Design a binder for these strands. Structure first.
Length: 49
DNA sequence: TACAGATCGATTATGCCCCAATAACCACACTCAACCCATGATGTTTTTTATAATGGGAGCTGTCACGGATGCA
């Protein structure tokens, strides 16, 4: 997978609602990784590694 | 005149003293280990060092996706 920024989605992970949870992803060539995530309550969350 | 026997003289038997090997039984012996006791060379362990030194992450891990509990807040 090439270094850069990629965006993804979820297809039925949250069975309670069935919403689509988009997320962003930063993967450098070397170094720590950065992720941006949504929630069913529509809130932004981050994750490192 | 025809027909008999009769003793010299030879192969066969049977046994054993020796004896030229036969075997067990007893006598004395050197050489080669085996273990030990040192001498010493090699090995192994302990001790100390006084300018000053005062908080790593070591390479993460790279990302699957079910279910069943589960411990909370």
């Amino acid at each position: 997978r090439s270094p850069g920024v990629f965006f993804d989605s979820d297809k039925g992970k949250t069975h309670s609602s069935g919403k689509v949870l988009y997320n962003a992803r930063i993967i450098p060539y070397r170094g720590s990784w950065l992720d941006f995530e949504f929630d069913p309550k529509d809130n932004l969350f981050v994750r490192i590694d």
